Amino acid sequence: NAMKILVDENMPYARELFSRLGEVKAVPGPVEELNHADALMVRSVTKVNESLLSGTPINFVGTATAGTDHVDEAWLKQAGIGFSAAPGCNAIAVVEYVFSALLMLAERDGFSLRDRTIGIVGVGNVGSRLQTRLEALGIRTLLCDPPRAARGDEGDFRTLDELVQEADVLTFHTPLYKDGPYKTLHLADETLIRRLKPGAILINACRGPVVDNAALLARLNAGQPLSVVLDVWEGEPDLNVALLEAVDIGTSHIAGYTLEGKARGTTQVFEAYSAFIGREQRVALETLLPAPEFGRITLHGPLDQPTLKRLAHLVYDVRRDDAPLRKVAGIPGEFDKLRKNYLERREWSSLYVMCDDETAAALLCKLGFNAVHHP
Amino acid sequence: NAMKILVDENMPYARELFSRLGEVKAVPGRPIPVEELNHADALMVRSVTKVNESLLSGTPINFVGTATAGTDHVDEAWLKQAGIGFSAAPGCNAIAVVEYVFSALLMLAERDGFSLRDRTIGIVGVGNVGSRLQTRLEALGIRTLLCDPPRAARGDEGDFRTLDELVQEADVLTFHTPLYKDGPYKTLHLADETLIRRLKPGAILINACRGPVVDNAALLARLNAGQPLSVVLDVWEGEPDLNVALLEAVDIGTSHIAGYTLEGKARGTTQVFEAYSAFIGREQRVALETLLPAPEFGRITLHGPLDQPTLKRLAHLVYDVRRDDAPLRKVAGIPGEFDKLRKNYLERREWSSLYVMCDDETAAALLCKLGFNAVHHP
Numbered sequence: 001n002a003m004k005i006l007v008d009e010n011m012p013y014a015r016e017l018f019s020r021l022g023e024v025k026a027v028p029g030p031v032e033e034l035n036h037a038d039a040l041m042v043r044s045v046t047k048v049n050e051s052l053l054s055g056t057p058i059n060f061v062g063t064a065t066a067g068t069d070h071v072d073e074a075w076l077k078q079a080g081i082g083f084s085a086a087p088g089c090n091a092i093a094v095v096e097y098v099f100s101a102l103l104m105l106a107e108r109d110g111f112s113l114r115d116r117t118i119g120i121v122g123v124g125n126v127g128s129r130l131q132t133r134l135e136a137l138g139i140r141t142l143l144c145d146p147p148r149a150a151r152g153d154e155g156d157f158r159t160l161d162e163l164v165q166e167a168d169v170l171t172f173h174t175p176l177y178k179d180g181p182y183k184t185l186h187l188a189d190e191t192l193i194r195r196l197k198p199g200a201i202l203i204n205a206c207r208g209p210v211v212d213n214a215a216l217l218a219r220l221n222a223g224q225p226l227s228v229v230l231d232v233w234e235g236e237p238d239l240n241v242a243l244l245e246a247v248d249i250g251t252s253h254i255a256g257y258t259l260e261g262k263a264r265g266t267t268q269v270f271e272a273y274s275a276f277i278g279r280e281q282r283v284a285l286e287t288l289l290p291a292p293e294f295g296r297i298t299l300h301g302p303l304d305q306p307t308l309k310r311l312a313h314l315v316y317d318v319r320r321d322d323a324p325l326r327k328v329a330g331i332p333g334e335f336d337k338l339r340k341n342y343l344e345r346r347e348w349s350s351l352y353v354m355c356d357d358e359t360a361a362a363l364l365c366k367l368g369f370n371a372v373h374h375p
Numbered sequence: 376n377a378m379k380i381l382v383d384e385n386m387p388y389a390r391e392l393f394s395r396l397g398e399v400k401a402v403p404g405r406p407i408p409v410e411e412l413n414h415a416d417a418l419m420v421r422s423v424t425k426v427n428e429s430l431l432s433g434t435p436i437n438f439v440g441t442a443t444a445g446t447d448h449v450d451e452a453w454l455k456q457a458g459i460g461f462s463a464a465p466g467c468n469a470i471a472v473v474e475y476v477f478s479a480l481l482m483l484a485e486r487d488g489f490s491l492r493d494r495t496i497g498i499v500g501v502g503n504v505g506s507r508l509q510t511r512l513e514a515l516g517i518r519t520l521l522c523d524p525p526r527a528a529r530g531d532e533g534d535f536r537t538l539d540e541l542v543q544e545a546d547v548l549t550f551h552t553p554l555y556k557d558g559p560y561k562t563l564h565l566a567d568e569t570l571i572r573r574l575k576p577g578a579i580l581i582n583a584c585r586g587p588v589v590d591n592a593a594l595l596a597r598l599n600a601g602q603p604l605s606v607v608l609d610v611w612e613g614e615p616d617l618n619v620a621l622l623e624a625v626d627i628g629t630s631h632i633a634g635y636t637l638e639g640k641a642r643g644t645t646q647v648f649e650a651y652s653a654f655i656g657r658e659q660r661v662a663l664e665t666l667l668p669a670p671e672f673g674r675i676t677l678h679g680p681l682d683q684p685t686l687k688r689l690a691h692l693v694y695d696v697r698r699d700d701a702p703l704r705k706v707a708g709i710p711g712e713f714d715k716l717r718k719n720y721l722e723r724r725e726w727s728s729l730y731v732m733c734d735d736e737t738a739a740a741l742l743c744k745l746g747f748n749a750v751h752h753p
């Protein structure tokens with residue numbers, strides 16, 4: 001008469017949390033416990049399907065990821081088995097990766113970020129959060145999301161062609177669709193890339209094939225005035241290395257990797273499961289996380305661009321992941337080795353900022369720092 | 376019957392500081408009206424004023440101050456002969472330069488994925504800057520070799536090695552000598568063609584002293600030949616007309632700004648204020664914090680022990696040398712922009728302006744030794 005919850009043994013905080021609801025056995029991502037369990041919380045490694053579950057009493061499957069590729073959500077729901085992913089769990093990580101790249105390019109190239117026009121392609125978990133933060137800085141942002149538009153969501157949704165005409169930063173946050181009216185495979189092909197404004201910045205931290213890597217390379221090689229930030233590559237793990245040499249920032253598909261991010265995976269699945277069994281519970285994310293290296297800092301004066309750059313980069317400077325990828329890119333095994341070995345990264349909210357300036361604190365909070373004003 | 380003190384009208388904090396000791400009149404440094412020198416008790420100058428018998432003869436001036444690290448514009452011997460007090464500001468800008476060097480090295484260590492404590496640092500010239508660099512590398516347990524024959528010939532105590540020995544055993548080589556055109560200590564092109572070529576594979580070469588200490592032509596020649604070398608340059612042969620292709624090739628190139636911190640610049644006036652206070656029987660020490668505006672980031676907490684990445688984050692919160700390398704690459708071949716970058720140089724602070732509270736006592740001890748204002752808060 002209590003629930004037996006199997007959790008993956010390398011899933012952070014899983015034992016801590018799930019015991020608020022039942023007995024936890026930690027399985028490596030083993031038959032005997034499956035047939036005598038009521039719930040299963042997994043990571044990407046475990047294919048979840050009829051094969052593995054049919055016949056068991058398992059009544060709920062949580063996956064601690066934004067992704068769901070490795071699960072057949074369909075069969076479970078067909079079967080009456082509750083399911084939950086952790087959508088958006090890594091979203092803030094990507095937004096701060098994007099901000100980290102932009103603030104570096106803004107200093108390196110002597111331009112003013114508040115002056116840019118930013119087109120967001122895909123306004124979902126990642127793009128909507130990016131929109132919120134760009135707006136708080138008063139940066140004009142153009143939104144492109146034909147599905148949301150078609151479905152009747154509110155907002156000023158423009159066409160991709162419109163974004164290409166008006167933006168000088170273009171960032172992609174769509175899924176990978178290979179056909180249909182919303183096809184995103186090679187959404188950024190030679191024709192689109194070629195129309196990009198002089199000095200435009202192209203950012204792809206979503207899925208590799210959304211950008212045609214060979215065409216992008218060719219335009220860069222012909223001298224198109226264009227800056228590029230890539231976190232995802234066609235052909236991963238065997239990226240186009242020549243392309244890496246021509247981009248301003250390339251990293252090994254680590255944009256989503258923060259500590260807070262891994263912990264939200266476990267956290268959301270906990271909350272869904274707690275709701276599933278009539279015991280809705282929430283969890284302080286700060287109760288779980290170890291203190292970061294730099295926890296508190298004072299700020300004197302207004303927030304300006306260089307001040308914001310020093311703040312974000314104190315937490316995460318994208319160049320620390322760019323440099324090691326350049327050192328090993330054409331060596332088989334190494335791309336994947338940099339993901340497995342990924343070093344601890346925190347989010348801006350882990351940093352407590354004490355501002356004597358009221359406006360700097362208001363702005364920092366809207367950017368996602370834990371900022372306060374000191375009268 | 377108050378002291379009359381003449382101050383170069385462009386020296387920072389001059390009136391604020393000296394009007395504590397006497398009447399203070401601001402004067403241009405070139406030329407100084409003679410009526411003024413004739414009624415003055417003390418003169419505080421910058422490098423534009425040649426101080427010698429022609430300037431001071433027959434005047435009542437009993438002390439000369441120069442808010443300046445160097446003493447080329449001053450006839451010190453003559454001042455001794457005449458009984459006139461003198462003070463420069465030796466080392467006023469040394470910490471600026473050292474924190475600049477650390478900024479560059481911490482950037483390269485991350486970029487290239489090496490640990491600092493696996494590098495051997497040869498310091499050439501071990502005076503005000505060289506010996507501060509030493510202290511700090513040694514506090515980090517980084518192996519350093521010292522080269523400074525003028526100190527060895529004086530019989531100074533230390534492990535003084537020859538230049539050539541540094542070239543065999545060091546993979547970081549950094550120059551802090553003045554420029555001597557000849558004599559036994561000639562530093563002109565001290566790092567020439569032959570010397571550069573012998574630098575260990577993966578070597579890092581830094582020059583933040585005087586442009587012509589390193590043969591820029593030879594260096595470019597080696598780089599073009601494909602020698603695995605890293606180069607950090609803040610000073611250049613033929614400034615402001617630097618070798619542009621040598622710029623495109625170095626890892627970091629900045630526009631002779633290594634010494635430019637608010638602290639460096641205010642310390643010229645400070646050390647001279649201090650020396651003069653003592654000279655007239657009013658020994659007075661003055662703390663920079665009460666003169667300089669408060670810094671943007673004045674306090675931060677550090678949880679746990681220091682490691683290299685943590686130290687890089689701290690040094691670069693304060694000063695990331697890349698912020699000076701980037702503007703120079705944008706405008707290097709445009710005649711006049713180099714001087715314009717120095718003229719409008721934006722505020723830079725020293726590590727001592729960051730107050731660091733560490734829950735690890737050994738992190739505190741170390742950061743303190745490194746020049747942060749670090750304190751253990753259990």
Ligand SMILES: NC(=O)c1ccc[n+]([C@@H]2O[C@H](COP(=O)([O-])OP(=O)(O)OC[C@H]3O[C@@H](n4cnc5c(N)ncnc54)[C@H](O)[C@@H]3O)[C@@H](O)[C@H]2O)c1
Nearest residue numbers: 122123124125126144145147173174175182205206255256
């Ligand atoms: N780089 C990383 O480490 C990492 C981390 C997190 C997410 N991602 C990827 O980034 C992408 C965005 O993630 P998310 O969490 O926001 O997912 P999401 O499902 O919340 O949002 C995707 C949005 O794109 C929109 N979209 C679909 N087709 C489009 C089209 N053709 N043109 C414009 N918009 C379109 C959808 O309507 C949806 O609003 C996904 O591909 C995700 O897998 C990568």
Ligand SMILES: NC(=O)c1ccc[n+]([C@@H]2O[C@H](COP(=O)([O-])OP(=O)(O)OC[C@H]3O[C@@H](n4cnc5c(N)ncnc54)[C@H](O)[C@@H]3O)[C@@H](O)[C@H]2O)c1
Nearest residue numbers: 500501502503504522523525551552553560583584633634
């Ligand atoms: N880049 C900048 O913005 C900047 C700022 C400050 C100082 N500097 C320069 O850096 C140099 C160091 O300044 P400092 O305050 O340490 O001066 P310093 O006089 O205290 O140091 C010079 C040291 O070098 C030694 N030396 C002389 N000739 C040598 C040689 N042949 N080989 C090895 N050592 C030799 C001397 O014995 C002395 O110890 C100065 O020349 C100064 O002009 C540059």
